[PDB]
C-alpha cells in the first residue's frame, strides 16, 4: 500500500492543481494546503473526476480503498499511480491521451475497463485481467487483439482502429455486445462462434461476406454501416433483429429483409435501392432511412402506419403522397427530390421536423397547419417550365405562393428582366436557350424558420 505516517497537506499528495481542488472537496477540507490523515484518505472508495483538466493522478496511490474511478475527458498520459490499487473493479478513463497501460497489468479484480478514445497500441498488459466483463478500446490504435484471447468473462467489448485478424475472439463465447467499428476487417468468419451475441456493431470496415452471421439468431441489433455489402441473403435468418443499419453499402436487393417483421428501425441510406416493395410488410417500423438511393415509387411505405421518422433525401421521388397515411410521422426529410405538390402533407400534423429543400415546391399553402414544426428547410427549389417560343419579348406568369397563399415576387430576374405581378417579362437581344428567375422569402411554420427560395428555368425554342 501507499501510506502517510503524519498528516500531510492535500497539494503535496495530489500535485495536479485540478485534482487537488477536487480532493479538497472530497475530503471535506477548506483549502488544498489543509493536512489530511491516512484515515481521511482511507475513506475514499469512489472518485468521479471527469472533464476537470487533470494532467496527473499522482497521489491517488494513497487512496488504497478505491473501487471505482472516473477520470474520463481529462489530459492523462501516465497512469502509474493506479498500479497497486488492487481493490479497483471499475475504471472509466475514455477521452485522455493514454498510450501505456502497463500499470493496469496486476489489477485482476477489474470487471469494467473503459479506455475508448486514447492512444493505446499495446494491449499486452490486459492479458491477465480475466475477471473483465466490460472492456472498451474503440478509437485507439490497436492492430493486434492476441492479448484478448484469455478474457473469457467478457460480455461487452469494443476495440480499434487497425485490427485485421479477429481469430483471438474465437473462445470469447460469453460475448453479448461487440463493437468492431472502424478497423480493417473484411473476414468475420470467427463471429459465427459468438452465438450469445445480441448486439454487433461493425461500421466502417471492409466486410462483403456476411455468411458467418447466419447462425447468430440471438442478434436483436446489427450495424454494418459503411462496408461492401451487396448480397444480404444471410440476414433472412436473423428473425430477432429489431434494429438494423446497412447504410453506406452497395445493396440493391432488399428481398431478404421482407420477413423480418420484428424490425422497428431500419437504416438503408446510401445504397443502390430502386425497389422498396420488399419493405411493405415491415409494419412494426417506426424509423426508416432510405436517403441516397434511386427511389421514385414510394407507394410501399403507405402500409408502414407506425412510421414516426422517415428519411428520403437524395432520391428521384416526384410523388410524396404515399406518406399521407403515416399519421404518426414526426420527422420527414426529402431534400433533393422532384416533389412539386405537398398537398398530401397537410394533415400530417404530428410533424415537428420538415426538410424539403431542393425539390420543385412552388406553393406552401398545404403546410399552414403543421403547428408542431420546430425545424424547417424549404430553400433552393428548382423547376423548369414547358418551353415557349424565343422572340425578343418573352412574358411568363409567376405562380409561387407562400404559406398564406400570397404570390412571392421574384428576388432576381436573368437577362435584365422585370416583374409586374404576376408576369415576368424579358427583352432579349438575341436567342438564348433559357432565361430564369429566383425567389427568396423568410417563412416561419410553427417555431421553425427557413428561407423559401428557388430558381425557375424557362427554356426557349429556337
Amino acid at each position, epitope marked *: 500500500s501507499a501510506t502517510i505516517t503524519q498528516d500531510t497537506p492535500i497539494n503535496q499528495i495530489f500535485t495536479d492543481t485540478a485534482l487537488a481542488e477536487k480532493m479538497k472537496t472530497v475530503l471535506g477540507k477548506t483549502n488544498v494546503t489543509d493536512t489530511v490523515s491516512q484515515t481521511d484518505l482511507d475513506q475514499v472508495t469512489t472518485l468521479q473526476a471527469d472533464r476537470l483538466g487533470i494532467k496527473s493522478i499522482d497521489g491517488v496511490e494513497y487512496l488504497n480503498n478505491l473501487t471505482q474511478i472516473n477520470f474520463s475527458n481529462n489530459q492523462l498520459t501516465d497512469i502509474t499511480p493506479l498500479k497497486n490499487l488492487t481493490k479497483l473493479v471499475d475504471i472509466l478513463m475514455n477521452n485522455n491521451q493514454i498510450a501505456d497501460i502497463t500499470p493496469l497489468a496486476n489489477l485482476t479484480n477489474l470487471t469494467g475497463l473503459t479506455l475508448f478514445n486514447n492512444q493505446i497500441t499495446d494491449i499486452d498488459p490486459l492479458k491477465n485481467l480475466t475477471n473483465l466483463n466490460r472492456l472498451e478500446l*474503440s478509437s485507439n490504435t490497436i492492430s493486434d487483439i492476441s492479448a484478448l484471447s484469455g478474457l473469457t468473462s467478457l460480455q461487452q467489448l469494443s476495440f480499434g482502429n487497425q485490427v485485421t485478424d479477429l481469430k483471438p475472439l474465437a473462445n470469447l463465447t460469453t460475448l453479448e455486445r461487440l463493437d468492431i467499428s472502424s478497423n480493417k476487417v473484411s473476414d468475420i468468419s470467427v463471429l459465427a462462434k459468438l452465438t450469445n451475441l445480441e448486439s454487433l456493431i461493425a461500421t*466502417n470496415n471492409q466486410i462483403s461476406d456476411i455468411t458467418p452471421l447466419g447462425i447468430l439468431t440471438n442478434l436483436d441489433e446489427l450495424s454494418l*454501416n*459503411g462496408n461492401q455489402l451487396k448480397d444480404i441473403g444471410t440476414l433472412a435468418s436473423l428473425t430477432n433483429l429489431t434494429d438494423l443499419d446497412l*447504410a*453506406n453499402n452497395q445493396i440493391s436487393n432488399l428481398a431478404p429483409l421482407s420477413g423480418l417483421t420484428k424490425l422497428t428501425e431500419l437504416k438503408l441510406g*446510401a445504397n443502390q435501392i430502386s425497389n422498396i416493395s420488399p419493405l411493405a410488410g415491415l409494419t412494426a417500423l417506426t424509423n426508416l432511412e432510405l436517403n*441516397e438511393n434511386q427511389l421514385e415509387d414510394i407507394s410501399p411505405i403507405s402500409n408502414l402506419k407506425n412510421l414516426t421518422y422517415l*428519411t428520403l433525401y437524395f432520391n428521384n421521388i416526384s410523388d410524396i403522397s404515399p406518406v399521407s397515411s403515416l399519421t404518426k410521422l414526426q420527422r420527414l426529410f426529402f431534400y433533393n427530390n422532384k416533389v412539386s405538390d405537398v398537398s398530401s402533407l397537410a394533415n400530417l400534423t404530428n410533424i415537428n421536423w420538415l426538410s424539403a429543400g431542393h425539390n420543385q415546391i412552388s406553393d406552401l399553402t398545404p403546410l399552414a397547419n403543421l403547428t408542431r414544426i420546430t425545424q424547417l*428547410g424549404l430553400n433552393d427549389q428548382a423547376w423548369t417550365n414547358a418551353p415557349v417560343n424565343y422572340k425578343a419579348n418573352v412574358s411568363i406568369p409567376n405562380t409561387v405562393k407562400n404559406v398564406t397563399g400570397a404570390l412571392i415576387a421574384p428576388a432576381t430576374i436573368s437577362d435584365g428582366g422585370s416583374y409586374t405581378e404576376p408576369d415576368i417579362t424579358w427583352n432579349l437581344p438575341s436567342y438564348t436557350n433559357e432565361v430564369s428567375y429566383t425567389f427568396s422569402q423568410p417563412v416561419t411554420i410553427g417555431k421553425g424558420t427557413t428561407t423559401f427560395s428557388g430558381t425557375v428555368t424557362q427554356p426557349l425554342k429556337a
Partner: nanobody
Amino acid sequence: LQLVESGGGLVQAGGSLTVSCAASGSAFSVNVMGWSRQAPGKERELVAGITRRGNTYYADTVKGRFTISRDNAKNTLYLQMNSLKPEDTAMYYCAALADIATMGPNDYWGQGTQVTVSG
C-alpha cells in the same frame, strides 16, 4: 464524438480561407457532418452539410463560393471559403447531423473558430 475547429482568421473581402474540424471517435466516418455559423446577436445558420457518400447541402448565402469536404482517413472536415464577404464574418462550428440540409433542436456544436472578413 469530440470535435475541434481550427483555421479561423482575418482575410480581406475577395479572399479565401479554409476552416478545419478534427474529430475523435468512430462516429465521424458514418455521420452526416455539417458547418454552422453564428455572428453576435444573430441566429445560427447551417452553412453546409456532407454525407459519407459525399452528397452536399449549401445555404443560399454561400452556394457557389464554399466547398465542404471530408477526409475520413484523417477524421477531418473542411470548409473552403472563396470570394469571402464581410457578411461571412462569424464563429464557424462543426457537428454531426441527423439531416443533410437542416439542424436539429440540440446539436453538439462545441467551441468553434472565428472568421473575420474586412471590407
